[PDB]
Design a binder for this molecule. Sequence first.
Ligand SMILES: [Mg+2]
Ligand SMILES: [Mg+2]
Ligand SMILES: [Mg+2]
Ligand SMILES: [Mg+2]
Ligand SMILES: [Mg+2]
Ligand SMILES: [Mg+2]
Ligand SMILES: [Mg+2]
Ligand SMILES: [Mg+2]
Ligand SMILES: [Mg+2]
Ligand SMILES: [Mg+2]
Lengths: 252, 134, 291, 97, 87, 110, 85
Amino acid sequence: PEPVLRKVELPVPTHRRPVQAWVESLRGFEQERVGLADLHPDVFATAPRLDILHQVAMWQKNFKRISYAKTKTRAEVRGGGRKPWPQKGTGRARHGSIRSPLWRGGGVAHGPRGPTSYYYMLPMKVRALGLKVALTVKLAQDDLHIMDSLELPTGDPQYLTELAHYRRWGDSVLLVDLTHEEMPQSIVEATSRLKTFNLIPAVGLNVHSMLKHQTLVLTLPTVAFLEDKLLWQDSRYRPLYPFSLPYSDFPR
Amino acid sequence: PDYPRFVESVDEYQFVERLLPATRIPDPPKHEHYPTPSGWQPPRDPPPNLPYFVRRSRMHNIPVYKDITHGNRQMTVIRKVEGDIWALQKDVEDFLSPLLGKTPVTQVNEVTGTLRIKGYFDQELKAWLLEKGF
Amino acid sequence: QGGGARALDLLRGLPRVSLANLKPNPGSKKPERRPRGRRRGRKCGRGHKGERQRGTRPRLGFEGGQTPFYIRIPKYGFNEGHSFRRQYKPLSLNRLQYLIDLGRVDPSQPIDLTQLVNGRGVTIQPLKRDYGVQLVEEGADTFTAKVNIEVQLASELAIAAIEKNGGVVTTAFYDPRSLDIVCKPVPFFLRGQPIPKRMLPPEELVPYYTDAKNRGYLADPAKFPEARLELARKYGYILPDITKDELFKMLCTRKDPRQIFFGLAPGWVVNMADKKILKPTDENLLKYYTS
Amino acid sequence: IGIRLTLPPPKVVDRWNEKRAMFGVYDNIGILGNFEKHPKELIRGPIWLRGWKGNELQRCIRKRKMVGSRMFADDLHNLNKRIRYLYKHFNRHGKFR
Amino acid sequence: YRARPPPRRRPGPRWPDPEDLLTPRWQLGPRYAAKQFARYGAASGVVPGSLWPSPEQLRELEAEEREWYPSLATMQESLRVKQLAEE
Amino acid sequence: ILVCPPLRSRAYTPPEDLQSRLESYVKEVFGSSLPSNWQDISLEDSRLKFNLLAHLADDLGHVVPNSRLHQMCRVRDVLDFYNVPIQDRSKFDELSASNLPPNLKITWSY
Amino acid sequence: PLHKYPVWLWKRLQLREGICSRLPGHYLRSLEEERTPTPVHYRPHGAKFKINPKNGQRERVEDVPIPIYFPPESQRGLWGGEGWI
Ligand SMILES: [Mg+2]
Ligand SMILES: [Mg+2]
Ligand SMILES: [Mg+2]
Ligand SMILES: [Mg+2]
Ligand SMILES: [Mg+2]
Ligand SMILES: [Mg+2]
Ligand SMILES: [Mg+2]
Ligand SMILES: [Mg+2]
Ligand SMILES: [Mg+2]
Ligand SMILES: [Mg+2]
């Protein structure tokens, strides 16, 4: 009776038309098709770059890894400053210490020397393009669902599981809200007791979480938030200084 | 601590806001005559009805660049190609063949949407793509 | 059109993209080579004995005992005093016209080094002994714009090209400390320090900026009309009368020799958090920032 | 000899615990958060390794100049020896010059 | 589950205890206070009058400038003498 | 208390009178002003596309997936979409559904 | 592991507890101060900047004091700050 239509706020290239998506509701088992949503083609319909997804996915796994494994070299093993037997005459092999790698209980020739950092930063546009490809892959595979709000009729976690099974979403569903302080209490109590249904803010969106979860759920404010954030990378000056400092027209 | 007195004013802050750089690249202003003295030309509206499409860079220029490897391998790269890139290869081949006297050696990268051509054809392809209105 | 749609509808029939079925782009990751096996084992790519296999190779440049090549050459002052020479990023009129036509540099306002950095037209590195930009004569034939630009150095031809179209070009000096402030005012405004007055050019650079032929900012304005006429006659163009122009006030807008920006006297403190400017009232402070 | 005669206990792995289900979250804190925070600031660990990477010689040099005054006497002595050894190895030994 | 609250840049000036020996010496000087005022404005609580040099520091600042940075007339007169010497 | 409805099957068979039924919904949404070239009607307006597709979903029990919405430029594309049958049978039943030879036996221990 | 405080801070940490913390406040100031002694065995530069003759540039100059060893016998007399070099 009252359709919910969302338009694209940012300008759209003339050679591409926006892609549509069904707007659904979480207030009932059969409250789907609340309206149509316009999605910017550059975000939800870009090229399917599987190789770009891999390097963004591998970046998140490895960049924050700190390996603490470390062994003791022959200089750090206690003792072993004394030559065991004279160089010649004993008729045995010649050794200079009892803590050499050849000796039992000695040091390691080439072992780990932790703590080690694997930190590296992909270019900002590469990381932002990884999100667009991640969003495009989900929509192209009918795993992305647009919502208007995350308000459930009840805070029962069993209600959420039955709602997702009826619509055949999948074993794991990732729920995204615009902010963390504006999340409705109905969905917070329903997801906090679930293991495969996760609730994250818009800023906590990442490729690894999206690929791990079979189904992705977005709200209307989240879609507008993503397009504003992601399309800003496509047409922007090279940074004179980090954007955390004041600019003429940032933040939007 | 006997600090000197000061006066706080806001009328002079208008000269500070003009020193702030912008993050977004401004859209080029409309000009009475085209092309501009620098040679820049805006894309044609409506876009041409071709099986492929080459969009401008974020600086509003034709995405044709020269590439060189090993110090002797001269290449020309056509980037940001959407649609049927294979139709673009045929058009490029039929356009560069008279200039070279032979079929150009080209590489088509479907995943990245780039066309790579052996030899320098930067200024030749930039003028050629402006004719089609890209 | 055809390519874009074919690349996504084909993805629909494929299984779900997950962390399992991912792989790197082919040719983007060379396999690691390790000293194992018959091919890469045994001497492991080191040869037969000697310093090569034992990892005791001599230093780079050592020639086995004879006098090294980089030593037997005589010393000449090619790079002597390289860190005290002044560098100027060239600014071609082709580049300047390219920025104007795209709106990145507005010709309706006076153009200084701040506006060029704002439009990403030039990249100034004060830490790399840069002292500003030099206006070069490349592309002077196709330049057609009336601008009020200020550049640290300018060639004789580039000055003539701008003044032919009715513009004004002036040369001003910036010290390395002031140069970093001009290029990135925002990082300086977050240091909580009052705006300093730029220092006068060194004794060697004084003649350049006190001569009207170079359009110096410390030159006698009475000699500017004489110099502008000589360039008009030499290169064969009629010198325009900018007094009759409507932008005469904008073109004549020039900053004080001790001033960094327009309308911002030295000693002021920019408070961007409250959008306020603090002006000292101390008699001793005012004498320091006005002398 | 050298091979066990009994199967090891099964390795039950919970793929949906708190840490795995929330791994990678906020890795886009800068791009999606007006660049107020940096993704490298999310990194936890040694104070000489947060948002930095280098080889073993650089890690030892960086560790010595940041937490060297807090290291134990035996640990600091070992670090100085390691830097002395690594300096000689990298700058005097190898296949390439 | 539910994700933890997002890491936010903790607002407000950070004033460490000057009596703590683990406080770096660069967080207790006037320069640190000056940078806080520029970033946060009046919310920093720093008296704006402290940003300008003190009368004792102003005399030192003038003394250095006078010795090393001469006036325009001083440089113009020096050039004239040198030019006559060369001629 | 909210009770979940039983799970809906994905099997879909195009009705023989689909074109007549679809034409009825077209006149409801776009009016009776234009009764010619009804398959060429453009779905640019969001209200018109939403009304047409929601009515079909509630009627035929088969909704258009989000990967197909952008392709529905005209009502002609909408008709072709609903002419494609959908099978929800499992692989074991599909294999047994085929005329298995007497020497071929399939076991499903799942 | 690591110490909570740097090793060079332990001397001033022992003045925070024990009988040292109960010492008069004015006395504790006299120890924690590190006033530089008057130069004796070296000539101070006198200025903060000098012009290096080779390149003719204004470079910063600092006075680095020369370590002085005071024998135990110097504590029973008045050497004027002098000592063995
Ligand atoms: Mg030992
Ligand atoms: Mg010994
Ligand atoms: Mg030995
Ligand atoms: Mg051991
Ligand atoms: Mg290249
Ligand atoms: Mg062989
Ligand atoms: Mg071999
Ligand atoms: Mg062997
Ligand atoms: Mg040999
Ligand atoms: Mg080496």
